[PDB]
Structures are given as structure tokens and as C-alpha cells.
């Protein structure tokens, strides 16, 4: 799939909780973890649409109360090819 | 896909109706029908997440009216490799 | 590990939710699902004591509201060699 | 196209939303993503003055309520040649 789930959090401990939750809830792949700055960490998953909706509702609930919290939880069902250049293909 | 959708019903007729409904309404494979006993019969369907969701919804709506009722509708998007053994591993 | 975890439920749909939750949450092996009769289904998970504690708590929190519900969530950290015989070694 | 459109957001999830919205809304070119620091992310698009105006208006509404939100939505119809040294030629 090509749908995109993105969970931003205030820390890496709420982000790892979210990644685990998301990647256990549905058939999604963890494509990246980005340190934005200011203490903002984004875990981006790529799966089919229903899979990503389920994963991002599992991640949000999980990390809502782990560490400093959850900032964003956003699904983008199709991503322009332009936006794919600014997106991580693997988590290393 | 690997998602599992199950409906618990009181009786075999409501269950059969529900199974047929789910199947007709979505791309799911009916893993099987297992009688809990005590009158609970549960029908298992495996599919991609969204399809499973739709199938479950259809089966539910349909068999609530039929018989005593629909005991349960639950969707598990991903099944741990270990949980496989309890679910019928048999299409039959 | 020898600790036993057990979740009896009223139906197989809450039980399957519990087996999934337990397996995903902690490092526990699913050793069996038993149809007791009367619509009671037990799910037995054998692992290490902390793992089994995590598994049983995750399973109960999961199957508590699915279907008819949770009858019991129990941990037995060491079972006597006599109780072993009754317990199912591998799932059927 | 030479015009610049730039959306600054608090975090990367709103920025990815704004970049998708912008690239989809018009014929702009996603030209770079910048991690400023303090959790500010700037997405920059280059297209005709009509294209960039259409894109930034859409991106401003898209990411206004995604994550922390929009810091700035700005359009520069013509950038001085000096400024083009501090502008990314391609996204990284």
C-alpha cells in the first residue's frame, strides 16, 4: 500500500509506544522515525488505506498518555510524487 | 490479507446468514464456523483490513434480526503468528 | 517459562481477542483454547512470570467488552506437576 | 515558474500535510523541506505566480489544524537572485 500514517509526539518514548501500537494493530510498515527538533519525533508508516487508518487510531490512543504526549496523528491516503521525495523510505 | 473478522451469534442459522452476507459483501475468505457450545456459533473470515471491516459490518447488520441475535462483532486487523493455531487454519 | 496465564470468556470471539492481545503484548506462548461447555472458552498462555502477567492484563483489558465478555483472568506462576496433565501442551 | 510559496509549521506532520495539499492544489514544484529548529519545518514550492498563490492558499487551510498548526503561509512572486543561494534547489 501507499497510504501514509504519521504520528508526531513530544519525545521518542511516546513515539516508540506509537510505532509499536501502529505496527501491531494493522499490516503497516514503519518507513521512518524523524527527529524534527524542539523535542518533536514523527513515526511514519505506509500501508493500504484501512490498514493505515486502524494503525494510526491504535498509535494515537497508545501514546496519548505516554511521556509528554501526542501532537499529531494524520492519514494521507494518496501522497503526491513530489511529497515522496520529503518522506523516509526506510527507518535507518 | 491476514486480518480476522469474527461474528458470534446465538444459533447456527443466524450465523450462516451472517457468513453468507459477509462473503457476498466483501473480499474475505470464510475461514470457518465453530460451535462454542452453549449455543454460540462463531464465523471466522480472513481478509484485508478494510474488506474485513465491511464484511463484519454487513454480517452484523444482517443477522441481528435473524434468530436470538448477534452476540459479537469484532475485527482483529493483525493476527500474531502464534494466535494462528486457535483460529481455524483450515479454509474448510 | 512455566507461569500459566488463563482467560475464560463467554464465547470464542472475546477469547480470540484475548489470545491476540496476550500474544502481541508480551512474550507468552498460546498453549491452548478449550471449549469448556455452556459457552465458556478458556485461552491458556505459558511463559515467564512477568511476561504472563503482562499478557493476562493486556488480554483482559482487550476482551473485557468484546462479545458477552471476560469470565476470569488468572495467573498461576508455578503449576504443580499434577495440574500439568490437565493443561493442554499444544493448541488444538 | 519562479515564484516561491513557503509554509512554516510547528512540526513535520502538518508540513507533510501542507506539501501534499500544495502539490495537489496546483502545478507548483516541491523544492525543499527544511528543519529550522525548535520544531519549525518550512516546505517551499516554486511555480508560476498563479500556481503558487493557488497552492499556498490550499496548504494554509490543509495544515491549519493538523498537529501543532501553521506558523506562516507566505508567497514571494519574485525572489532576488541573491536570495536564491539560501533556497534549496531540490528536496532532500
Amino acid at each position: 500500500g501507499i497510504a501514509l500514517g504519521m504520528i508526531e509526539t513530544r519525545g521518542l518514548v511516546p513515539a516508540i509506544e506509537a510505532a509499536d501500537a501502529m505496527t501491531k494493530a494493522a499490516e503497516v510498515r514503519l518507513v521512518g522515525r524523524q527527529f524534527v527538533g524542539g523535542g518533536y519525533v514523527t513515526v511514519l508508516v505506509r500501508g493500504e488505506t484501512g490498514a493505515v487508518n486502524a494503525a494510526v487510531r491504535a498509535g494515537a490512543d497508545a501514546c496519548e498518555r505516554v511521556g509528554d504526549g501526542l501532537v499529531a496523528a494524520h492519514i494521507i491516503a494518496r501522497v503526491h510524487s513530489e511529497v515522496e521525495n520529503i518522506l523516509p523510505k526506510a527507518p535507518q | 490479507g491476514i486480518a480476522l473478522g469474527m461474528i458470534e451469534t446465538r444459533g447456527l442459522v443466524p450465523a450462516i446468514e451472517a457468513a453468507d452476507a459477509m462473503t457476498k459483501a466483501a473480499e474475505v475468505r470464510l475461514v470457518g464456523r465453530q460451535f462454542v457450545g452453549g449455543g454460540y456459533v462463531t464465523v471466522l473470515v480472513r481478509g484485508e483490513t478494510g474488506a474485513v471491516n465491511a464484511a463484519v459490518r454487513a454480517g452484523a447488520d444482517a443477522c441481528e434480526r435473524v434468530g436470538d441475535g448477534l452476540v459479537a462483532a469484532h475485527i482483529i486487523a493483525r493476527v500474531h503468528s502464534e494466535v494462528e493455531n486457535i483460529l481455524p487454519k483450515a479454509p474448510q | 517459562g512455566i507461569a500459566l496465564g488463563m482467560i475464560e470468556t463467554r464465547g470464542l470471539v472475546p477469547a480470540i481477542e484475548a489470545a491476540d492481545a496476550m500474544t502481541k503484548a508480551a512474550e507468552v506462548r498460546l498453549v491452548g483454547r478449550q471449549f469448556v461447555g455452556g459457552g465458556y472458552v478458556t485461552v491458556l498462555v505459558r511463559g515467564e512470570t512477568g511476561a504472563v502477567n503482562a499478557a493476562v492484563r493486556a488480554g483482559a483489558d482487550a476482551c473485557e467488552r468484546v462479545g458477552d465478555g471476560l469470565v476470569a483472568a488468572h495467573i498461576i506462576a508455578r503449576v504443580h506437576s499434577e495440574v500439568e496433565n490437565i493443561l493442554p501442551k499444544a493448541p488444538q | 515558474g519562479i515564484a516561491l510559496g513557503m509554509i512554516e509549521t510547528r512540526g513535520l506532520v502538518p508540513a507533510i500535510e501542507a506539501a501534499d495539499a500544495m502539490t495537489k492544489a496546483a502545478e507548483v514544484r516541491l523544492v525543499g523541506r527544511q528543519f529550522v529548529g525548535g520544531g519549525y519545518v518550512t516546505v517551499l514550492v516554486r511555480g508560476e505566480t498563479g500556481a503558487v498563490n493557488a497552492a499556498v492558499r490550499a496548504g494554509a487551510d490543509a495544515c491549519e489544524r493538523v498537529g501543532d498548526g501553521l506558523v506562516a503561509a507566505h508567497i514571494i512572486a519574485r525572489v532576488h537572485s541573491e536570495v536564491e543561494n539560501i533556497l534549496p534547489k531540490a528536496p532532500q
Partner: peptide
């Protein structure tokens, strides 16, 4: 009422 992962979105999701 479907019991399982909920496709329906809770408010937090965007």
C-alpha cells in the same frame, strides 16, 4: 456494534 479495531475515527485523529 462492531468490536475490533475501529475504522471510525476518534476526535484526535486528523
Amino acid at each position: 456494534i462492531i468490536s475490533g479495531t475501529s475504522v471510525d475515527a476518534s476526535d484526535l485523529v486528523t
